[PDB]
Amino acid sequence: AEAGITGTWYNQLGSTFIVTAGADGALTGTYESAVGNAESRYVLTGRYDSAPATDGSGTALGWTVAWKNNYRNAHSATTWSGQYVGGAEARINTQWLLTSGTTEANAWKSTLVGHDTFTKVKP
Amino acid sequence: AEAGITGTWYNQLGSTFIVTAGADGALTGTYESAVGNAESRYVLTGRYDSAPATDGSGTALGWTVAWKNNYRNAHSATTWSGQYVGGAEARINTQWLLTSGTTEANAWKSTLVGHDTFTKV
Amino acid sequence: AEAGITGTWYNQLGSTFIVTAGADGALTGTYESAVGNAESRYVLTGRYDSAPATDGSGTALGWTVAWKNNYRNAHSATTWSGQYVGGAEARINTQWLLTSGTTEANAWKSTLVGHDTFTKVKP
Amino acid sequence: AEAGITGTWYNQLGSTFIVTAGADGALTGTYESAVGNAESRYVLTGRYDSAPATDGSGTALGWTVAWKNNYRNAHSATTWSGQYVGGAEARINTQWLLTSGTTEANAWKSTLVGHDTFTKV
Ligand SMILES: O=C(O)CCCC[C@@H]1SC[C@@H]2NC(=O)N[C@@H]21
Ligand SMILES: O=C(O)CCCC[C@@H]1SC[C@@H]2NC(=O)N[C@@H]21
Ligand SMILES: O=C(O)CCCC[C@@H]1SC[C@@H]2NC(=O)N[C@@H]21
Ligand SMILES: O=C(O)CCCC[C@@H]1SC[C@@H]2NC(=O)N[C@@H]21
């Protein structure tokens, strides 16, 4: 649900995700990573299922962050694909892909894969 | 500059991707899939490096599509992560993650992974 | 190390992994999954770095299980790629790919991706 | 039966894969990579469906290579998961995970993902 997704979330690495879920299925906010070639906040944009199933299923969503802001440019972008599970302890479970720009030759080693779990902070 | 990312692209499955790249890094557009539980167009939003390195490297980017529109709701979302290479034959080489909303018990098989290559041909 | 890897391991889904690490970098054993179209034990084969780095790095390894035994055939195979971290609480952290045989047409949806963490049981 | 998996295959990077498939599902052989921190041949072991479905589907399989041999030790291992399709032009279509041994702090960037297509050409 939008209200459930909107808020401040943190993951196991200590990164911060601030997001607003719009009525049209949109997600906008900023992301701050605790690791990597990144500093300060970066803009994020994404989409989510604004009409999930009426059962105990998670709400599918995803977002992207290109790691360029006014202070650094890492020449990379990460996309997180996962689901939102609301409740007393709401979590967003994801798997992500991080692609770095490379020459054709090194293209075989351009993408990392991992997974992150986010916990919502009260409010 | 010289990022002919804006345009209509097609992938090996015959899906169509129409995007606009903004000077500061935004990507907006619509996606139409030739396969799956989808029909007509869906809204996409992403980001790209608006200042790629000045060496022979590609431009990293990514975008998301939540598979809900006025015709169907597949309760899933796909994110594509990859890089753009321009020139005579410009291509966008990606790897994607498709997550469906499941119950806890089926969370272990909620995500598919694949790769798509787009061209303007 | 071989001695450290050899043993019985379980993951968060309740699946069992019994393995022997050979001096030549080989892994052989059986796997029993708590979920899926599987029943009883399946043979597994893999390899590991028999000469890791002398630091606090994990030992890279991977193994495969084709889901066919004398009782079922799911027409699929899973490969786990990860690292072994030994110590008092040794763990094997992995990411896996599960490919199902399909017709060319449905090949775009043939592979699932996930991650599993294994805990070693005493002995 | 009719699984011409045994043989010498090559992928788009020019790497060579020589494998033998056993009647009960084992795969054994050697791998030589044209890229990376590797040189000469490495041992591979895997498994495949020795009884694939009798419809027009491919044969699922997978194999592992730990990148250590008498010449180099890259402290990494790659696993390829995919399916074999035979016929005039037989191919093995895969997705792979390459994990390097890291310290805890760098565990978040320990794994690369990619895709390789093999042919006997
Ligand atoms: O190093 C880079 O190229 C940019 C920073 C990447 C940080 C990654 S994105 C996935 C993972 N989750 C995080 O919170 N941070 C890392
Ligand atoms: O079935 C669904 O859940 C919605 C359609 C999914 C279509 C996928 S997304 C990745 C791949 N690339 C495409 O162009 N279409 C498929
Ligand atoms: O359903 C199938 O095709 C065969 C069983 C798959 C079980 C998978 S493999 C990865 C994950 N980890 C487990 O312990 N079980 C599931
Ligand atoms: O650099 C290393 O760690 C060892 C060599 C890795 C080579 C990889 S494995 C996947 C891809 N396919 C190949 O044929 N080679 C690269």
CA distances to A122, D4, D39 from A89, in Å: 10, 52, 50
Domains belonging to chain C, first-starting first, are 1-123 (2.40.128.30)
Q: Which residues lie closer than 8 Å to C35 by C-beta, 6 or more apart?
A: B108, C13, C15
- The pick from D9, D12, D13, D112 for probing ligand 4's pocket by mutation, whose C-beta has the most ligand atoms within 8 angstroms, reads D13
Closest CA to C68 of D93, D44, D63, D60: D60
Largest CA distance in chain C: 48
Sign of CA dihedral C79, C82, C85, C88: negative
Where b means 16+ CB within 10 Å and e means fewer, A22-44 reads eeebbbebebbbeebebeebbbb
Q: What angle do CA B108, B113, B116 make, to 5 degrees?
A: 165
DSSP symbols for D97-121: EEEE---GGGGGG-EEEEEEEEE--
Cα of A96 vs centre of ligand 3, distance in Å, is: 21
User: Residues enclosing ligand 2, CB less than 6 A?
Assistant: B 11, 13, 15, 33, 35-38, 67, 74, 76, 78, 96, 98, 114, 116; C 108
D13 CA: nearest ligand 4 atom: 14
User: Is the CB of D103 inside 8 Å of chain A's CB atoms?
Assistant: no
Structure tokens at C6: 């050899």
Instruction: Among the bound ligands, name the one nearest to the CA of residue D37.
Output: 4
Q: What is the distance in angstroms between the Cα of A23 and the nearest Cα belonging to chain B?
A: 13
Cα of B17 vs centre of ligand 2, distance in Å, is: 12
> What is the Cα–Cα distance from D90 to D88, expressed in whole angstroms?
6
When CB atoms are compared, the residue of D35, D97, D109 closest to A108 is D35
Q: What angle do CA A8, A13, A17 make, to 5 degrees?
A: 20
Contact: D76, C60; criterion CB under 8 Å: yes
- Say whether A57 sits in a helix, a strand or coil: coil
Q: What is the dihedral of CA A52, A119, B105, C46, to 10 degrees?
A: 130
Residue recorded with tokens 């006997």: D120
- Beta pairing partners, A94: A82, A116
Q: What is the distance in angstroms between the Cα of A119 and the nearest Cα belonging to chain B?
A: 16
> What is the Cα–Cα distance from A97 to A104, expressed in whole angstroms?
19
Q: A68 with A57: CB under 8 angstroms?
A: no
Beta A73-85 vs A59-68: how paired, if at all?
antiparallel
Q: What is the distance in angstroms between the Cα of B49 and the nearest Cα belonging to chain A?
A: 6
Q: How far apart are the first and last CA of chain D?
A: 22
| Reported resolution, Å | 1.4
- Beta pairing partners, C71: none
Closest CA to D64 of C64, A123, B10, A98: C64
Element (H, E) at C2: helix C2-5
